[PDB]
Design a protein around this nucleic acid. Structure first.
Ligand SMILES: [Mg+2]
Ligand SMILES: [Zn+2]
Ligand SMILES: [Zn+2]
Lengths: 75, 1327, 49, 99
RNA sequence: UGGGAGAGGUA
DNA sequence: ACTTAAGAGTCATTACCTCTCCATAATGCGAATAGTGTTGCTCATTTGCTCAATGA
DNA sequence: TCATTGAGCAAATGAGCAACACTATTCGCATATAATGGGGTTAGTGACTCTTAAGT
């Protein structure tokens, strides 16, 4: 995800949807201070979220149902 | 703050008084003792808000504790000072004056509403002549412009019944007394009795104007300004200078003029002034108000103090330095740098070297954030001073911040979309931005003093755009054509050519090696050169059916340099990639093959490694230029002496007086062209194969290792024309008058020119340098016009499910193949199947993206023409679907929905503007008596199809041309089959027998004369413009009959065998002779960038081609006039159509045959409007695409046809209606074609008749102005006309364009913002 | 004095001397500019002049 | 030359131009078309609003970048308000119709 | 500090 | 009833750097109004200090 | 018996107002031999389109 975001593009299916999903994940890492599921190896949150999509943990519907799970566990 | 629409309309005086906060009643702005603003002035605090934050003028209320109050001492409302640029005033004008926009912007709208001439309205406004409003008597009607003498007559005559006023108040009273619905109804009745052309157009213009007023709800009295509003005093600011003197805006001067003349008019109306003085003052106020609204419009422009015309409001908004194009579209931008660019070849593909000081200045608030986070600075002031002192902990924090934070490298002029790329920056010590050498083919940047801008994305969304969309490892392929633009350029190319070339017996020839590593070991040890022909063992990896890689290992006859590059070439490519001498086209094919096989990441590392090895081995080469390397051919002086002797021989023949001067001139040019070609060929021979001193077989020959030939053959820098000017002959240089000079520049750039040859060369050098500047300006103007047409086009749907398409045949005009089927169709989506047996019976289904494998199958089975879905035929409303467009050329797969096509298409078109067997089809013929076949049709094409089924060439034969070969005959090459009379047009027949000379008498239709060579008489039919009174009603006919005299019929039809021949016919055939079938009877005689701009602006040319509007036979109906009318009646129904043709133009189609829909009646260039309206949408699309691509192939630039089809689809947006059904379209209103498609869909859903239409090809300027969005149109061009039409019609903007959301300030519906915009659209729909 | 100071100080031809080396001084004095008061512009100049 | 945040103009409230007066680089019409061709709508929005003539948005952007949270608080620019006031001072009612 | 003209230069 | 001339209008690339330059003319004399100084006075703000319960 | 919490209070300083008296600004008004129609552009654009008007 440092040099090329190609395999994350093939995992997502859309460049613009990849930007939107990684933006929400990076906002959750910058604002809320959530736990990154990958080793950060002293990278920035943009590359960490892109590496999470590169592995395949972060998707639009997966992050939405996870956010829904945290919201329903808040209530 | 979240608004759906920007509604524009006219402004009532009540609305202007509702905007304002206080009447401005004094011209003086501020004081001079203390600089506080005045009371009721142009800068007044009580009207325009307070000067300081939360403070009055006297100093009573001075804190936020008194949040909002009015000061009882000085009236200054205690608020923030931001409301000094949000509060307007108003001037109460004494005499109500007229708006200059809705009076002078043609059409005037006041002359078009009141139905009075503009000169008479201007005479009324200039107080020169009275106008009468109402009159009870029948002598004075409404709108009868009286003079002063006529009004003084009428005053003493009636004096009580009529009321006539003079000036703008009279026009206000006239617009008040008129009745909109009554005049609209009267003109609707007036339109129905008779319809002259000019009267119906004027009446429908007035009816459209009146219906616009009634449907918008405006009133016609609102065009007369009674209350004039005032701009806020921080939008017409008062800025000082450095020496105490003030430099105000010109708006303050114009407002001072209006206020002073209005106050003087109030004083003159109170002082009971004479009529002449008060009329002149009313005229001065009108002139001052019109100057403030538009200075240069009404008369002489009011100049300021420094003899320059002042800037009004219309000059602030409209123009090149207006508000729109200087601040709304393109703004200045913070967090931005600029420096010179140098070369960094130690970098990777996605890196650039920012300097330390410049990036410290760029990333300064980020350094503030990390300093306060790490606890090294308590406050923002301490962090500011720690950065300003440039400490070592600040440099370490900057090294941590700039890591993995991409910046955009922009370089102006950004022609295409690769002029902005995002790079991960690497901090270097210096002052120059170190680019990668590969991206300077995309940037079009050489290092001769260039400068690049560095913009820093701030937010996380912006960093992700720069990381996923705009990273320099992502856009390798160019978006114009699907070829890689990250390509080795000139230095890597010279190095790789010197590597993979081979000598004959260089060093260590004929060994056997254990592989690529031992070959590299041999070269770097020095026992073998780079050019030794050696046998190596190569283990190449082929690709399996799935993603696995099988291997093969054998011995190949290679060189050492190719066996060094096999360490670089990744696993997956064959050895035929590497095993030739690599020019620039060869390395382009290498990167393209590596892309299509492996993907992106092996392609990125292959480009970096091939650049490293190219640079390293070009350094180890030492490829130098010298004066012994530009080898002059040793037979140059002999050819030059022979050419000068031959030119002198023709010169003395002309001086003797045999050959004329023009033929001498043409002969001298042809001789010097042949001499220049011979010298250039001898030079190219002696430079290509001069290396002949060889050994180890015998004296052998090979290509030369000369460096000039090396950097020419590699495609690195230059071409054979440049090598010809260096070593051979300079050639024929042209004068600035276009004519080629007779004597050429014989010397080259090695022997040195003399004085006169250099002075001749300066003509073409300065002409080329002058031409280059002009084309760039033209290309940028063309690019702006193309972008502002194709703004509103984005992908919306995934598939529309249409069955239309454009059948892509390879363009086969002339003697060669211009574009193959691979370049024509690779990328698009097949509409129908491919129904041909062939050899393997390929059957691709519909909705299939044509990959390279499918195109390879099409090449193997040799398909002639395939029908694929185009952008023009797409059936999606407000945007196209992905399946009609096809392949995203920058990526290499299908196009994602939501990506803006039209901006990429317009950029790709307007970027190279700074560089600019016998087969018979459509026949009707008859076999003659000798077998020399003649054709009786004009539209006959002679197709040349090979034995496999594919087409080789194409030729169009004339009507009446002779032909020796029939269908199915396979003739060899070089045989001249095209035999035709070029100057004469025959009138040939298809039956035999005798001729009856009927309806021609010597004296009134034919001229009795003889031929001067044979003595036989010849009967030339006299033209009707010089005939006598007896020939004004007859048409002479060659009445062909049988052998005894009965009227023979045409076989198949019922028309008698007659031939109405036209005039000027050389009739050699007389009566009483035998006539065969098919023989003749008589002889009847006959830039790049401006062409692109005239095709796209859709200009009717200087001599249009007359076409047939209805299918059927053609006959003449009108006599005794030279304007030849054609009564082209159909063969089934009656004729409602005629056509007017001028005198001197000739005709191709005679009055005895039958033409189809869209036949060429008069030859010449055919206009694209009638091409569309007669042939069809696909035909005009194919015409525009072929004639644009002819220009772009003449100059040598590859551009895919889908971009030109996008511009054509954006040009065809309008559709006038010829007959309505039940929809809300009355007659001839040019509505958008998407609107009538939606209306027809709704009408055929609920079961009604529907409304037909007819499209019309608008130009680029007219389409972008007749775009339904007044903000997009006024940002493009003609801001005065667009805002006037929108204000009168009461239009609104729905905010659906990319340019609109750039101006407003939202996310554009293009790419990432498409999801947000469709969510907002469904939120508005569901609620 | 106002007219002669305007011409010698703020005309279109009385321009700031490019004197960064002696060659630029001598080629700015041997210069024949076809523009100025009563001449062409950069808009009214085609490939003829 | 480089600029982080300096002086701003008075009519349009967008940053100044020039190395001598600490100016920002112009993001011209050609570059707006290049961002439209890329599809970087978020980069285009943050280069037309918070790096340019929008005082509330740029002040909240500066405070958010200093406070670590790289978030976007957009708004309407002030050159558009300059345009609305100039058309209204010409005498043509243009308004932002809500919904 | 900010604005407007005129001249020159670089890509 | 339609067809050529005259006239008006509207555009003609992008980005950056340097320099200079951006004004002169009637006097005077009361009337009247805005501005500033003067003195007495009140009112809001803050701080060290004092007074009253309360358990340890 | 004393530290801690809850409440308040005289006093000093900062802000300001209200009415009145002096004074520097500013504006309306008057000049009496006779005086009786103005400067200042743009000048080697090109191409195209729209409207109006004489010509057929
Ligand atoms: Mg350059
Ligand atoms: Zn106040
Ligand atoms: Zn479609």
């Amino acid at each position: 995800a440092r040099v090329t975001v190609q395999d994350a593009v093939e995992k997502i299916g859309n460049r613009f949807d990849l930007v939107l999903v990684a933006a929400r994940r990076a906002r959750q890492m910058q604002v809320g201070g959530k736990d990154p599921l990958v080793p950060e190896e002293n990278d920035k949150t943009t590359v960490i979220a892109l590496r999470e999509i590169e592995e395949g943990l972060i998707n639009n519907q997966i992050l939405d149902v996870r956010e829904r799970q945290e919201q329903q566990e808040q209530e | 703050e979240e608004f759906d629409a920007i509604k524009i309309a006219l402004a009532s005086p009540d609305m202007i008084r509702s905007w304002s906060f206080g009447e401005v009643k004094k011209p003086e702005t501020i004081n001079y003792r203390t600089f506080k603003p005045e009371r009721d002035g142009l800068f007044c605090a009580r009207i325009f808000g307070p000067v300081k934050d939360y403070e009055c003028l006297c100093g009573k209320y001075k804190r936020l504790k008194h949040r909002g109050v009015i000061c009882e001492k000085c009236g200054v409302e205690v608020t923030q000072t931001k409301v000094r640029r949000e509060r307007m005033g108003h001037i109460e004008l004494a005499s109500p004056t007229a708006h200059i926009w809705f009076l002078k912007s043609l059409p005037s709208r006041i002359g078009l509403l009141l139905d009075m001439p503009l000169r008479d309205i201007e005479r009324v406004l200039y107080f020169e002549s009275y106008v009468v409003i109402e009159g009870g008597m029948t002598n004075l009607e409404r709108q009868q412009i009286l003079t002063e003498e006529q009004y003084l007559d009428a005053l003493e005559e009636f004096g009580d019944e009529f009321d006539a006023k003079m000036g703008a108040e009279a026009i206000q009273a006239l617009l008040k007394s008129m009745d909109l619905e009554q005049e609209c109804e009267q003109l609707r009745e007036e339109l129905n009795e008779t319809n002259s052309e000019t009267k119906r157009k004027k009446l429908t213009k007035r009816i459209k104007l009146l219906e616009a007023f009634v449907q918008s709800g405006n009133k016609p009295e609102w065009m007369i300004l009674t209350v004039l509003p005032v701009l806020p005093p921080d939008l017409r600011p008062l800025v000082p200078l450095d020496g105490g003197r003030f430099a105000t805006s010109d708006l303050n001067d114009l407002y001072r003029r209006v206020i002073n003349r209005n106050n003087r008019l109030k004083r003159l109306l109170d002082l009971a002034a004479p009529d002449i003085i008060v009329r002149n003052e009313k005229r001065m106020l009108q002139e001052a108000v019109d100057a403030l609204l538009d200075n240069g419009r009404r008369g002489r422009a009011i100049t300021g103090s420094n003899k320059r015309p002042l800037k009004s409001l219309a000059d602030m908004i409209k123009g090149k330095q207006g508000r729109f194009r200087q601040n709304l579209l393109g703004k200045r931008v913070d967090y931005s740098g600029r420096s010179v660019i140098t070369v960094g070849p130690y970098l990777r593909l996605h890196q650039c070297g920012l300097p330390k000081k410049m990036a410290l200045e760029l990333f300064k608030p980020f350094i503030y954030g990390k300093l306060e986070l790490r606890g090294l600075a308590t406050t923002i002031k301490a962090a500011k001073k720690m950065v300003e002192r440039e400490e070592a902990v600040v440099w370490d924090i900057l090294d941590e911040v700039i890591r993995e934070h991409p910046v955009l490298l922009n370089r102006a002029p950004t022609l295409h979309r690769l002029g902005i790329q995002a790079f991960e920056p690497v901090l270097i010590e210096g002052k120059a931005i170190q680019l990668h050498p590969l991206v300077c083919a995309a940037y079009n940047a050489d290092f001769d003093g260039d400068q690049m801008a560095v913009h820093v994305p701030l937010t996380l969304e912006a960093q992700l755009e720069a990381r996923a969309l705009m990273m320099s490892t992502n856009n390798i392929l160019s978006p114009a054509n699907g070829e890689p633009i990250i390509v080795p350029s000139q230095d890597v190319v010279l190095g790789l050519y010197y590597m993979t070339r081979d000598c004959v017996n260089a060093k260590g020839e004929g060994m056997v090696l254990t592989g690529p590593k031992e070959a590299e070991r041999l070269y770097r040890s020095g026992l073998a050169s780079l050019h030794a022909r050696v046998k190596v063992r190569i283990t190449e990896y082929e690709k399996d059916a799935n993603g696995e890689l099988v291997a093969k290992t054998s011995l190949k006859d290679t060189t050492v340099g190719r066996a060094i590059l096999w360490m670089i070439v990744p696993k997956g490519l064959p050895y035929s990639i590497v095993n030739q001498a690599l020019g620039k086209k060869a390395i382009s094919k290498m990167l393209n093959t590596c892309y299509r096989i492996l993907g992106l990441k092996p392609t990125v590392i292959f480009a970096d490694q091939i650049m490293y090895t190219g640079f390293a081995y070009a350094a180890r080469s030492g490829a130098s230029v010298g004066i012994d390397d530009m080898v002059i051919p040793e037979k140059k002086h002999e050819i030059i002496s022979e050419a000068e002797a031959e030119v002198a021989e023709i010169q003395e023949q002309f001086q003797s007086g045999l050959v004329t001067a023009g033929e001498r001139y043409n002969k001298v040019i042809d001789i010097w062209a042949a001499a220049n070609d011979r010298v250039s060929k001898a030079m190219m021979d002696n430079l290509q194969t001069e290396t002949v001193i060889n050994r180890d077989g015998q004296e052998e020959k090979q290509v030369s290792f000369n460096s000039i030939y090396m950097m020419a053959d590699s495609g690195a820098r230059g071409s054979a024309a440049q090598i010809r000017q260096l070593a051979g002959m300079r050639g024929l240089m042209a004068k600035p008058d276009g004519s080629i000079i007779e004597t050429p520049i014989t010397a080259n750039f090695r022997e040195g020119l003399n004085v006169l040859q250099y002075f001749i060369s300066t003509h073409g050098a300065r002409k080329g340098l002058a031409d280059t500047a002009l084309k760039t300006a033209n290309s940028g103007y063309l690019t702006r016009r193309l972008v502002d047409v194709a703004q509103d086009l984005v992908v919306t749907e995934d598939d529309c499910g249409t069955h239309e398409g454009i059948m892509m045949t390879p363009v086969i005009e002339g003697g060669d193949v211009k574009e193959p089927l691979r370049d024509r169709v690779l990328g698009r989506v097949t509409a129908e199947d491919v129904l041909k047996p062939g050899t393997a019976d390929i059957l691709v289904p519909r909705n299939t993206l044509l990959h390279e494998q499918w195109c390879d199958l099409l090449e193997e089975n040799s398909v002639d023409a395939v029908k694929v879905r185009s952008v023009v035929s797409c059936d999606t409303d407000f945007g196209v679907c992905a399946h009609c467009y096809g392949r995203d050329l920058a990526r290499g797969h299908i196009i994602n929905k939501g990506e803006a096509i039209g901006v990429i298409a317009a950029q790709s078109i307007g970027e190279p503007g700074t560089q600019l067997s016998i087969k018979l089809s459509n026949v009707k013929s008859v076999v003659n008596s000798s077998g020399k076949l003649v054709i009786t049709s004009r539209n006959t094409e002679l197709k040349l199809i090979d034995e496999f089924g594919r087409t080789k060439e194409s030729y169009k034969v004339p009507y009446g041309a002779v032909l020796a070969k029939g269908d199915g005959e396979q003739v060899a090459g070089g045989e001249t089959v095209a035999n035709w009379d070029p100057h004469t047009m025959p009138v040939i027949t298809e039956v035999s027998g005798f001729v009856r000379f009927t309806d021609m008498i010597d004296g009134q239709t034919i001229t009795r004369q003889t031929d001067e060579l044979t003595g036989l008489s010849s009967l030339v039919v006299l033209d009707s413009a010089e005939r006598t009174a007896g020939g004004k009603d007859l048409r002479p006919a060659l009445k062909i009959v049988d052998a005894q005299g009965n009227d023979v019929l045409i076989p198949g039809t019922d028309m008698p065998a007659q031939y109405f021949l036209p005039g000027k016919a050389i009739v050699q055939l007389e009566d009483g002779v035998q006539i065969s079938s098919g023989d003749t009877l008589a002889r009847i005689p006959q830039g790049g960038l401006p062409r692109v701009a005239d095709l796209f602006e859709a200009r009717r040319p200087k001599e249009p081609a007359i076409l047939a509007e209805i299918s059927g036979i053609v006959s003449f109906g009108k006599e005794t006039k030279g304007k030849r009318r054609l009564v082209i009646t159909p063969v089934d129904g009656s004729d409602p159509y005629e056509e007017m043709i001028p005198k001197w133009r000739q005709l191709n189609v005679f009055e005895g045959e039958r033409v189809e829909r869209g036949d060429v009646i008069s030859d010449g260039p055919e206009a694209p409007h009638d091409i569309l309206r007669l042939r069809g949408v696909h035909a005009v699309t194919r015409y525009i695409v072929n004639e644009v691509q002819d220009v772009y192939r003449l100059q040598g630039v590859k551009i895919n046809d889908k971009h030109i089809e996008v511009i054509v689809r954006q040009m065809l947006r309008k559709a006038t209606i010829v007959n309505a059904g039940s929809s809300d379209f009355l007659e001839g209103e040019q509505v958008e074609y998407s609107r009538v498609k939606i209306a027809n869909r709704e009408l055929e859903a609920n079961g009604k008749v529907g409304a037909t239409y007819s499209r019309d090809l608008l130009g680029i300027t007219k389409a972008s102005l007749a775009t339904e969005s007044f903000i997009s149109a006024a940002s493009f061009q003609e801001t005065t006309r667009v805002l006037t039409e929108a204000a009168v019609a009461g239009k609104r903007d729905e905010l659906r364009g990319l340019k609109e959301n750039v101006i407003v300030g939202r996310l554009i519906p293009a790419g990432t913002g498409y999801a947000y915009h469709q969510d907002r659209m469904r939120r508005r729909a569901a609620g | 004095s106002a007219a002669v100071k305007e011409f010698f100080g703020s005309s279109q031809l009385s321009q700031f001397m490019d004197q960064n080396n002696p060659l630029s001084e001598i080629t700015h004095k041997r210069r024949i500019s076809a523009l100025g008061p009563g001449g062409l512009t950069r808009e009214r100049a085609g490939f003829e002049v | 030359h480089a600029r982080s945040t300096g002086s701003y103009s008075l009519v349009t409230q967008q940053p100044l131009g020039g190395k001598a007066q600490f100016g920002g680089q112009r993001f011209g019409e050609m570059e707006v078309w290049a961002l439209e061709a890329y599809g970087a709508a978020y980069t285009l929005q943050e280069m037309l609003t918070v790096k340019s003539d929008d005082v509330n948005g740029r002040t909240k952007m500066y405070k958010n970048i200093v406070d670590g949270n790289h978030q976007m608080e957009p708004g309407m620019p002030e050159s558009f308000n300059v345009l609305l006031k100039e058309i209204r001072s010409l005498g043509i009612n243009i308004e932002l119709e809500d919904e």
